Design an enzyme around this catalytic site. Structure first.
Site, short mmCIF file in Angstrom:
data_model
loop_
_atom_site.label_atom_id
_atom_site.label_comp_id
_atom_site.label_asym_id
_atom_site.label_seq_id
_atom_site.Cartn_x
_atom_site.Cartn_y
_atom_site.Cartn_z
N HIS A 82 5.64 -13.04 -65.55
CA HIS A 82 6.89 -12.77 -64.80
C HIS A 82 6.74 -13.00 -63.28
CE1 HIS A 82 10.70 -10.33 -64.10
NE2 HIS A 82 10.09 -10.11 -62.95
N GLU A 83 5.67 -12.47 -62.68
CA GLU A 83 5.47 -12.66 -61.24
C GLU A 83 5.25 -14.14 -60.88
OE1 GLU A 83 6.51 -10.30 -59.67
OE2 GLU A 83 6.15 -8.68 -61.07
N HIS B 108 8.56 -16.00 -60.90
CA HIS B 108 9.23 -15.97 -59.59
C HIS B 108 8.60 -17.01 -58.66
CE1 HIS B 108 11.85 -12.57 -60.13
NE2 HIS B 108 10.87 -11.73 -60.40
N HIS C 236 15.74 -13.41 -61.98
CA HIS C 236 15.86 -12.57 -63.15
C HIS C 236 16.98 -13.08 -64.05
CE1 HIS C 236 13.97 -8.95 -60.83
NE2 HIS C 236 13.05 -9.66 -61.47
C1 LIG Z 1 7.10 -7.54 -65.36
C2 LIG Z 1 8.14 -6.56 -64.82
C3 LIG Z 1 9.50 -6.81 -65.54
C4 LIG Z 1 8.18 -6.62 -63.28
C5 LIG Z 1 9.29 -5.70 -62.61
C6 LIG Z 1 9.40 -5.83 -61.04
C7 LIG Z 1 9.72 -7.30 -60.75
O1 LIG Z 1 10.86 -7.78 -60.92
N1 LIG Z 1 8.67 -8.05 -60.46
O2 LIG Z 1 9.06 -9.34 -60.11
C8 LIG Z 1 9.01 -4.23 -62.86
O3 LIG Z 1 7.99 -3.76 -62.38
N2 LIG Z 1 9.92 -3.58 -63.58
C9 LIG Z 1 9.85 -2.14 -63.87
C10 LIG Z 1 9.74 -1.71 -65.33
O4 LIG Z 1 10.66 -2.01 -66.13
N3 LIG Z 1 8.60 -0.99 -65.64
C11 LIG Z 1 8.27 -0.43 -66.96
C12 LIG Z 1 6.85 -0.76 -67.49
C13 LIG Z 1 8.43 1.06 -66.73
O5 LIG Z 1 7.55 1.64 -66.14
N4 LIG Z 1 9.54 1.67 -67.15
C14 LIG Z 1 9.72 3.09 -66.93
C15 LIG Z 1 10.39 3.35 -65.56
N5 LIG Z 1 11.47 4.33 -65.71
C16 LIG Z 1 11.07 -1.51 -63.11
C17 LIG Z 1 11.04 -1.93 -61.61
C18 LIG Z 1 12.39 -2.05 -63.75
C19 LIG Z 1 11.00 0.04 -63.23
ZN LIG Z 2 10.96 -9.80 -61.09
#
Ligand SMILES: CC(C)C[C@H](CC(=O)NO)C(=O)N[C@H](C(=O)N[C@@H](C)C(=O)NCCN)C(C)(C)C
Ligand SMILES: [Zn+2]
EC number: 3.4.24.86
Length: 254
Positions: free
Chosen positions: A184-185, A188, A194
């Protein structure tokens, strides 16, 4: 495609946190983890047909793995991405993610200028479930170093960078999860934004394979589409590769 310009060579950096917590304080364990991760990620990219036809074979390979065995000593008021303490709040397990990416980019500037991408692998629990961050595919930066003069830093830094942490909610993430974060990173970096809900083609329901890798939320990771790029990501990355491969991609090694 040009087989002599189809590979984005990476500077991979393992900070002292990664070395200690993922690498067991060993060069071998540290590097083997990263070598294998990048290779699995490369399988996703390399097999992707960006134009849904023959524009494929584009991927990533490690040029160098920097291994930081101990924290970076800093003077008072000075910071460094590999310093012992987190910033801005040392009471927290982790840095503010955006500030870390900026700091990494500042500290690694001279090295970053010589590679397609630089990527930091760390082991810290970012607030609220965040797992990584990268430049490019933002609504600039990404593949091939592009200068940005930092008024605060007083020098040029390059926006060809990103980072992954393999710690979330007090535990080491699964290897299948780590692969997804890095994919994913780098996605980008390669120019993808996204996948938005409003385009079903790019954000399918669970019964139809689930979400693609550029979806902004990370949960589960066991669905068919989860490891792959959507048509939206392909269109963005296709355009990026077309403009950037001649600039900094190289021939695949080995
Ligand atoms: C590979 C992932 C999709 C990267 C993104 C951040 C991003 O867009 N990097 O480019 C992320 O950390 N997403 C988190 C995420 O979905 N984390 C999961 C593992 C999580 O911890 N979910 C529980 C949080 N309430 C967010 C920011 C949405 C909380
Ligand atoms: Zn992202």
């Amino acid at each position: 495609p040009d087989p002599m310009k189809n590979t984005c060579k990476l500077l991979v950096v393992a900070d002292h946190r990664f070395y200690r917590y993922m690498g067991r304080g060993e060069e071998s364990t540290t590097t083997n983890y990263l070598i294998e991760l990048i290779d699995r990620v490369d399988d996703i990219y390399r097999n992707t047909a960006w134009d849904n036809a023959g524009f494929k074979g584009y991927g990533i390979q490690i040029e160098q793995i920097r291994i930081l065995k101990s924290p970076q000593e800093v003077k008072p008021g000075e910071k460094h991405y590999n310093m012992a303490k987190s910033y801005p709040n040392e009471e927290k397990d982790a840095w503010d993610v955006k500030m870390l990416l900026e700091q990494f980019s500042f500290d690694i500037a001279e090295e970053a200028s010589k590679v397609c991408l630089a990527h930091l692998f760390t082991y810290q629990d970012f607030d609220m479930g965040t797992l990584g961050l990268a430049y490019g595919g933002s609504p600039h930066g990404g593949v091939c170093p592009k200068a940005y003069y930092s008024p605060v830093g007083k020098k040029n830094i390059y926006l060809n960078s990103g980072l992954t942490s393999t710690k979330n909610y007090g535990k080491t993430i699964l290897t299948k999860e780590a692969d997804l974060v890095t994919t994913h990173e780098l996605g980008h970096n390669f120019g993808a934004e996204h996948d938005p809900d409003g385009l079903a083609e790019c954000a399918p329901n669970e019964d139809q394979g689930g979400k693609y890798v550029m979806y902004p939320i990370a949960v589960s990771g066991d669905h068919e589409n989860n490891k792959m790029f959507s048509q939206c990501s392909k269109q963005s990355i296709y355009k990026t590769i077309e403009s950037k491969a001649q600039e900094c991609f190289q021939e695949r090694s080995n």
